[PDB]
Amino acid sequence: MNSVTISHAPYTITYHDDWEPVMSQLVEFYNEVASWLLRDETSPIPDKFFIQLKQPLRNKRVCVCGIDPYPKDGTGVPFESPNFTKKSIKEIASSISRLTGVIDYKGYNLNIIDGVIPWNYYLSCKLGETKSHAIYWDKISKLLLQHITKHVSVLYCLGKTDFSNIRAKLESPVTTIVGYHPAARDHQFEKDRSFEIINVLLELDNKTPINWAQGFIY
Amino acid sequence: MDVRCINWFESHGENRFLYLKSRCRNGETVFIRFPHYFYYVVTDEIYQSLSPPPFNARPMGKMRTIDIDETISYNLDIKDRKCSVADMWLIEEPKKRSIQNATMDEFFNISWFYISNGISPDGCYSLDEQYLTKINNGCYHCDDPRNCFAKEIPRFDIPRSYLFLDIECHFDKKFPSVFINPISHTSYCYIDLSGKRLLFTLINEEMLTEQEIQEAVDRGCLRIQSLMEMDYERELVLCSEIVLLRIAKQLLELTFDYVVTFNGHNFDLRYITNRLELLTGEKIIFRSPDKKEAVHLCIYERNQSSHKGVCGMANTTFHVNNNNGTIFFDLYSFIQKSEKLDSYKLDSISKNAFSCMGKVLNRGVREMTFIGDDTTDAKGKADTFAKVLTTGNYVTVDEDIICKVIRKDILENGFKVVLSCPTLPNDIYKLSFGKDDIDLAQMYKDYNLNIALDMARYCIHDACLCQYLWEYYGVETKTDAGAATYVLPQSMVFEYRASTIIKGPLLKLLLETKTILVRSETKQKFPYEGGKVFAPKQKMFSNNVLIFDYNSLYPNVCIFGNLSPETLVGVVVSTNRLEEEINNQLLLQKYPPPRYITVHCEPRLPNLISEIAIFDRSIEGTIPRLLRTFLAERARYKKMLKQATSSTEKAIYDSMQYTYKIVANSVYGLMGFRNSALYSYASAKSCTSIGRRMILYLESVLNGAELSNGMLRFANTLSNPFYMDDRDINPIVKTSLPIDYRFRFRSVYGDTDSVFTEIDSQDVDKSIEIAKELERLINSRVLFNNFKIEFEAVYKNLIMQSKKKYTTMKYSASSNSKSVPERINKGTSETRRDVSKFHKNMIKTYKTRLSEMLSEGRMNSNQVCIDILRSLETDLRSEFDSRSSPLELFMLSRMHHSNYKSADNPNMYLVTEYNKNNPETIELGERYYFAYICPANVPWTKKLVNIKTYETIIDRSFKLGSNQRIFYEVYFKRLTSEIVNLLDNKVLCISFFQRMFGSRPTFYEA
Amino acid sequence: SDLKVATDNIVKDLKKIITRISAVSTVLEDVQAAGISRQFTSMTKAITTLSDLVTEG
Amino acid sequence: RSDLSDLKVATDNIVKDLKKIITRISAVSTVLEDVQAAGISRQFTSMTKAITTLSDLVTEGKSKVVRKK
Amino acid sequence: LSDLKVATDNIVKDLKKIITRISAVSTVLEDVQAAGISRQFTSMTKAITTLSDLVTEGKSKVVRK
Amino acid sequence: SDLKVATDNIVKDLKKIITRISAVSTVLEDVQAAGISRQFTSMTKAITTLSDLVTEG
Amino acid sequence: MHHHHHHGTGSMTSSADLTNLKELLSLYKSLRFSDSVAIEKYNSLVEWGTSTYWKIGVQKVTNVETSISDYYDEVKNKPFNIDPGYYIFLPVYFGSVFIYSKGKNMVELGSGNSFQIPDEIRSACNKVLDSDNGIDFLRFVLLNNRWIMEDAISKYQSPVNIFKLASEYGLNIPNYLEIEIEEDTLFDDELYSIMERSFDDTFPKISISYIKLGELKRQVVDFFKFSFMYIESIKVDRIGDNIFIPSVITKSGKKILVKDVDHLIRSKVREHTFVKVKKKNTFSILYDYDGNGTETRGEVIKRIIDTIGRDYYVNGKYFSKVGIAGLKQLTNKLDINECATVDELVDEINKSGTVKRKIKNQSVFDLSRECLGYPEADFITLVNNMRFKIENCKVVNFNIENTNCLNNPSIETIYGNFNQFVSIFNTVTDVKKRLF
DNA sequence: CAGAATTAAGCAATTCGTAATCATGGTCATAGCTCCCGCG
DNA sequence: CGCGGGAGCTATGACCATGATTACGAATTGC
């Protein structure tokens, strides 16, 4: 649980000891991308760009990866909205509702799940824009997902178009599930039963299956 | 009104449309917006079974449906392959829907749009105007493409517009980052509809002081402060970076036919759009021709996984999200797909492409004046060199030294160049346009106006070099022919590989032959034996070797025996010789030999001993007459190659016919490829089996064949090897040769379709016209049906070190004895890309040495082993001690992919480490230069381990450190093992290899 | 010929011993077979010395 | 000879009898040394045939118990 | 000869070979007796008795006292 | 006719033994005398065993 | 041109691929008791999951050591104290232990091969697996050409209710008892012997496996003394028609039972030698040991066939004798009425519609190979060295070219009976032509 | 209202590097095993 | 006089190190 100084607006960024092998390169990449990144108003606050750097990676066996935060009201934690207005976490909660048989809930949060680290590939985006900070976060996103997939057993990707390159963005073999995004049309995310597939692929790796009922906020 | 299809391009989002980019005769760009809707093919009862009616449905007629599944039958009796003829209707929906038991799902909607509406994507059409509906100026909308695109007028030349560009960026580090490094130059080649090629370079003015800016204004450069002040006619324009980016943006938003870059989607266009988003927040907005939907320039990565091994990601190409119709074309990706070169950096492509032989008229102390014309090299090669010399700056002489162009003269039939070259004794030297031989980061450290104008010249050389590679590879002609043949949009032609480009003419054929292919069970992959390779009879041939090459062997196999998945009657297998004999006789009586061909093939399973594939030749399959279409295209581009005179057009049309040969062998290979829907293991296995029996037949006929008294006789009879045929089987064949020509032929080597026929004559012209007589006599009597061979070459001094590895002098059928031979290397060290240039140079020199001491015959074998190993000893110790040769002639190269069975593969780990440490990100499919590098304090290493750990990827900005050195030992190990593979006295070779490298040398066994 | 009848009784006893070796040798355990192969290498050494004495003298 | 429980007494009897055979072979060898040092003229071709059959029989008895795995 | 150590070592090292050859003669005689051939042992008895009484007088003459 | 001449060579060898013991036996020293005395008791034990073999019939 | 993805991704997340992943997990948990068919299905699902997901936790297997010792604890050769509770005492029989996987095909312990079984007993076993899907495998024993269901190892249901349903289904079960143990009693040889006498089973039982109700894991207990008995001769006695079990006779006269042929060849039993036999008061049990001789397996086959008889051959797990084959053996293998002529045989196969289905479904060669009881691999090896002259799919003349296979005495014996094979082959060929 | 949209040619044969496997040899425990001395 | 304690030699099986063989995959090309 260490902090490394950044020249730009997130001056102190806090990282767990599991994140330590890639922080000397993350600071190098962020000190060149941030001076042009922070001109645009970012959907998460820059003070909370790296609040999932605080999460350990040894206990996590599943990485759930979105490509970016929400275009508005980004809290820095992927797939968290305390107002529960976002359709992506709503459809995630619907899929887990069919999974776990839990119909009564007030929100869903993937950060409180043991063994699941909710990840945004690009750590920020502009207000009202999707994948706008792609060019800023390409190198940092590559390096951080390189680091995550060394520790987690199963990577789940929430984008079919957005994570089509993910076998090139990663180079270490990891269990990669490129799933449909919850906000994708045709209700393809309603149709797929990927969260069981996460547990079965963990059972293939002799890992503890994710109890997805931990994510519900009562 | 008459148009010619420039490009087809589809828009997505909201209402989904297809667009055509077209040009009329007067020069107006005309767009036709079609409705783009999904295409499905179902039976008539299924078409009435959909409760939601389709948006449109028009009848395709009663079309037979063939279940192309391979079931091995131990008994002779086979179920007839399903031939359910039903009336089929084209389901046309604007929204994607899933239909149960829907057929023909392998094809794209765009090919279905082409063929069901009868539109050729490379065609000229008189558009029936009342079907067109005018949206705005230049854009029309055609609801009924069948009736509007009905008149296919022939070709007319159109004013095709272009924009060729490279950019240069300031790297104080090894490689530019977007965020910290500015753009120095953006060089542009604006070829508009009026046809004049405007060559202008935009120069950044924040990289220079106002003393240097006003000096540039005094020297003729134009200084601008806005977009409207910009003049495209001015050769050199000074501007701010933000105005430079706005000029770049407004040029890229122009509706060109082609914006062509080299490595520019990956670097130049991405850098332009990202630096434009950084400095001013603007984006390069591509608008649709109806101005409905507009997208920004976002370079999307596209990855192609491999189809062998673990199916890892093997190639990465970058493209532009365009919807205005401009074919944004990266030449890096195209030449990576097409050419086979050590690296596809632009200066290596300029090494390979614009290589001309130059005579010397004047010699000076520091200036060497080269002349090149139709007498020095091939016709049209000197125009191509002069065309590059119009903007070229540095010319590489004999691929080793790089010389700056002092003064440029463009002749009528060649070039006149003055080069900063040391005085060289020979008169004719190879001239290539490859390297600049500069430290660009060093010129960025001490940037001035003279350095700015020099890199403006180099940047406009690169931008026009995109055009010279465009015309050298003939990419608009290649694009048009690929669009017509593969029935694909012009922007889609090279981007897909074989499997998609088959599907266009395959769909044309399956609608023509009224046939649908379906599969019920899963496709199962088995290993099958390929084409037969014969061991060489001996290593050296003093005596001339005739080369007989089948005209498209595996296509002619598939056409001859009607090898398709759909015409496979079934597969008869036997675990035992008893049911093999029963099935053999009962196979002959059930299936007649003319209409059905039984191919005795290699078993798919270990318990089976025979696997006989039966093909119905009564009705022609879709794979054979698809191959007939592909060899028709190859034959017409081959006869356009024959009528071609200039070397550039000859290279274009030779690449055309080679590409069509490759895609015909891909119609082959998709039957061997499991994940294709044209997969037919029996058809591909029997294709290799018939090709095996044909090369065995042509070998056994040509081996032991003698010519006597003007009569050519063969050792074996001229029987069709699969059945009794109507043609006579008499090996006694009358020639049109003189009586006194008594010469004996024997086969010494055979690789798949190419038998190497050693005639005992050494006369070149005699062997050539005797071999033309042999080619005529085999094509008239020995071969049958579609099978033809061509006498390609006479191989003199054929040095076969192994199978698939030979060096020889080639005399073609058009060439004579007095004509100069072309030294052909096939699979040897000069060909291979994992072999360093120093290795290639000493293999060439020692091949020359061994050839001359074996041709003289004065000198014995043990002592020539002595002196050539002592010469190797002194050369390798001089190279290890002096280290005079640079790093670039010890650079290996390999393709960066992810197709690795091991997670911890050292090559993959090397590229990932270099991608972490260096600002270069080596993409997938990139060919990177790497060398074995060790610290210089390490002495000569006897026993070699951890060789992959000594690999260091070499960049053009990479310089070898003083502490580091080239690991010469393993290069010398490979060189020594090839050299002792060349020559005799193996025990001394073992001792020599053991004393120098602590190891037993690898040795070939014949 | 006392030496000849002594060697004849030796080879008859050893023939009976090798027949019961064939009787027990299918299921001899590893330390068992190691010991009896050690004794058979001692056999080969002893008959090597005996052959040297009958050859050289 | 019939229905023996463990091979250990059987193989121990085998080994002890074979120690007796090694002792008797070394005994006949070291008295052959004495009769050769005596200087009496002897013809030992049939003795060489006897040791040839001895070596063949010892090899036949050895080869069944030589090697594991 | 000085200090008589080499003489004692010499007279010790041969007598083990002597008793080895005596046991060899005993074992060859056992091998003859177990062969079943008919044998007379009179001259051998005379040789062993004269060896025995020469050994006993040597033992009486080698006493430490 | 080989065992008899073998014992005759043994008798001649022990004749050499007893003559050299009688030559050196003017001084013998006590511990080596006790060692060769126990050697001679082992000799007489082996001779008694061989005499039992020749006199058992 | 971005509308065809950066790199197209399959629908991993679809439900059918979840069923493939769950099947991959189920056959991964069943690796040690699956056949080669389910091993190939597991490897197909592994390569699918590796092409589909960029890594999976499981890897491809080239060979699986087929052992069920995770469910089955160490065999106790000494008396012990049994805990209080309810137990299911099941007798372990002498023959080769076979296991019926969830893939509806029978697996051999120690080899993993699929032995080929009669149709009714496979149908009964498949209906047993259709009754309870929680069964991991069905432990079977093949002794004297009989399949006894030893045990039904299942996650949930006790084997007692399995056994009565299998006995109604036609399967062979032991007469087993379930009892309480009242107190800590030394499980000795006397209580073992009266437990064996309580098992009213004529067929030989080598040990007893008891199942706790509290614990799913079960343990085999076995009280015996190792014995090494001299061998008088080796005999075969006929257990089915053309089916012979090997047997070993001692010099005392007591008969050592032999599991299969490959037990007799693996342990290298020779006459006038010693073999490892487990001794009981009731019978004798040959140990499953490897032979320590230097004699190769083919020369053991040489010597065994030479001692028994030249017209005996190895047929899988049982010896088979050759003879003059005719319509009687074909009607016996077809399980149909005895028939005088081939015409009458054609008629009765037409009368019995399922027998006509069986004639249509398998080939002439497989029928004629099974009718004489030839093995699979040995007879393919024999025919693969022979050239045949043939009229009308009938062997008029047979000759062999390569005599290297005649060193195999089973192949030599089947070559001796190849005239009768040709006669039955022509008969079955005429039957297949006249039916169809 | 907050993305999806499938491709993908085969095998033969050589070379080279790495890693598993095996032949050969060196070394070390280890049982045979045999004698020296000794003490009752 | 007879067997136990001790010590030294000596083949002999097992283990380990070194180097040669070979399967095995990548890289490449010929086809």
Ligand SMILES: Cc1cn([C@H]2CC[C@@H](COP(=O)(O)OP(=O)(O)OP(=O)(O)O)O2)c(=O)[nH]c1=O
């Ligand atoms: C090049 C190539 C060839 N093949 C097969 C198919 C046939 C044989 C011979 O083709 P060849 O190159 O000699 O020339 P060929 O195709 O026979 O045509 P020409 O000899 O040029 O007329 O090899 C293939 O499968 N894949 C390929 O990429």
Ligand SMILES: [Mg+2]
């Ligand atoms: Mg060809």
